[PDB]
Amino acid sequence: DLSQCDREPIHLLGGIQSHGVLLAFRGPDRLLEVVSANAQALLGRPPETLLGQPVGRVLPAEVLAQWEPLVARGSVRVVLPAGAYRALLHESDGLTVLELEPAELQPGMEETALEVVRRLVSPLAGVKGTQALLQTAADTVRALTGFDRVMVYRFDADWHGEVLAESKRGGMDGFLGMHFPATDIPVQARALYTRNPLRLIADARARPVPLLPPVVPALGRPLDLSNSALRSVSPVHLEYLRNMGVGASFSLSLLKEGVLWGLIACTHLEPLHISHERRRACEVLTQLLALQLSAEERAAEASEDAHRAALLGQLATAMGEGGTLEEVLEKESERVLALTGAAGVALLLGEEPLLVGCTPAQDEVEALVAWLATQPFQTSFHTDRLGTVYPPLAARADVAAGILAVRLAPAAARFAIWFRPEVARTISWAGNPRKPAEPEPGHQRLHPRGSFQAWEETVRDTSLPWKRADLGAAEGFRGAL
Ligand SMILES: *C/C=C1/C(=C/C2=NC(=C\c3[nH]c(/C=C4\NC(=O)C(C=C)=C4C)c(C)c3CCC(=O)O)/C(CCC(=O)O)=C2C)NC(=O)[C@H]1C
């Protein structure tokens, strides 16, 4: 992909976080093949001397005595000398990978989890706007995690993001409404998070624990840690969190109708571990928000549709109430523009264009009509930045930053073109986006940027996007012309 942020193979770093232990076994004798260098944390004896041993001679009796439900469920609670641990299994590179990490200590967590689910599945939830949905999603995740700050972060069209909503304890500073470059979460990070929706950085300042040996010897590269709960993250991102003053981090992928829409990102000023079962509870809340968002969006799409269907009906009644088509369209100007949420429309019904609302002058309409007759667009053409593809109108963002054109004749140049002004938006970046990272001379190390202080730009010359109901309304109005 684009830069070297994207090139770091974050699933192949060969380290796990220090609060857990990892063990990987091969073949039917279950021979210890990959083990973390801290494995004495939970194995009585030094890990390098257990490379090669069958699992019955490696693992504590405790874990062994739970081996059956472990194998069949992929997850079980074990009570070690060192406390209650949560043991997880998965498969990677032809190995069975056992991960142990401290287990949930509150017997009532799940009970607490069901109560915050209620807040978010609630009878008529999200009824005071989807902003209120985002806030409640932030509120319930922080209520359940104890994280100092919880945010809802949304990826925009170019994969830079913005904070839509924030929930934070009193005195925490936040980033509500701020924008962040796409490189802050690079492309191979976003692909990993599409397949693994959860990740915890329990202590941003702790050192990664290496795996032994540093390659899986069959393959000659490190063990793949894509599906590991204990995967230690890219050192650059740990530096990023240090620069933010963040001691611990936990984020959840928001997948909406197949694709990565955003994250629920949590941060804490001190280290903080969240149990595997408490993070699975937070995942239920994220899927719940994604469900509520989809439901609310489809409903909005449906209600908008009915509005445009009401309109063409009111225009149909209006025609055939007397007069010519140009006559009734002129009187029904407001409805004609409403169909696509436009400020103006030019109709080429044969002769010189009929100009309704604010449109460019007659001559600019004639030039554009002649140019649209050249392009390939089947039946309808639309853009929200006319000026990047049609320079003669590039300076008239006041009346024609976006257009929506429909063909009224096969080879002839007959069209309805709706126009939209620009919509200026003043955005605050968290840091200077022209300098999204501080590379070392020679560009081999790379470091995060040093400051996240507000940096303001106004985006000009672009209209509100054309909505699906806009294109539907226009297609339906071609018949009447
Ligand atoms: C040149 C490389 C860069 C880089 C690398 C990077 N970032 C990664 C993960 C990650 N970044 C964020 C960003 C944010 N956290 C916030 O709170 C906000 C806004 C308020 C932002 C924009 C997040 C949330 C994550 C996910 C991990 C987490 O802490 O929850 C990764 C992948 C880490 C991994 O191993 O998975 C990489 C490689 N960041 C840069 O800024 C540049 C320099």
Author numbering: 9 to 489
Authors' text:
The reported structures are of a SaBphP2 PCM in the wild-type (wt) and mutant forms determined at 1.65 Å and 2.2 Å, respectively. The cryostructure of the His275Thr mutant is essentially identical to that of the wild-type, except at the location of the point mutation where the hydrogen bond to the ring D carbonyl is absent. The conserved Histidine, although absent in some myxobacterial BphPs such as SaBphP1, stabilizes the Pr state by forming a H-bond with the D-ring carbonyl and the Pfr state by forming a H-bond with the C-ring propionate. Serine is absent in the SaBphP2 wild-type protein, and likewise, the mutation His275Thr diminishes the Pr/Pfr photoactivity, possibly as there is no stabilizing amino acid for the D-ring and C-ring propionate in the Pr and Pfr states. Upon Z to E isomerization and by rotation of the D-ring about the C15=C16 double bond, the conserved Histidine 275 must move.
Phytochromes (PHYs) are red-light sensing enzymatic switches first discovered in plants, with homologs in the photosynthetic and nonphotosynthetic bacteria. PHYs are composed of a photosensory core module (PCM) and an effector, enzymatic domain. In bacteriophytochromes (BphPs), the PCM consists of three domains named PAS (Per ARNT Sim), GAF (cGMP phosphodiesterase/adenylyl cyclase/FhIA), and PHY (phytochrome-specific GAF-related) [Fig. 1(a)].1–5 The effector domain is typically a histidine kinase, covalently linked to a PHY domain, although other nonenzymatic output domains can be found. However, both proteins bind the same bilin chromophore and share a large amino acid sequence identity (38%).5,14,18 Biliverdin (BV) is an open-chain tetrapyrrole that is highly conjugated and allows for reversible photoconversion in BphPs between the red light absorbing (Pr, λmax 700 nm) and far-red light absorbing (Pfr, λmax 750 nm) states. Here, we report three crystal structures of the SaBphP2 photosensory core module (PCM), lacking the effector histidine kinase domain.
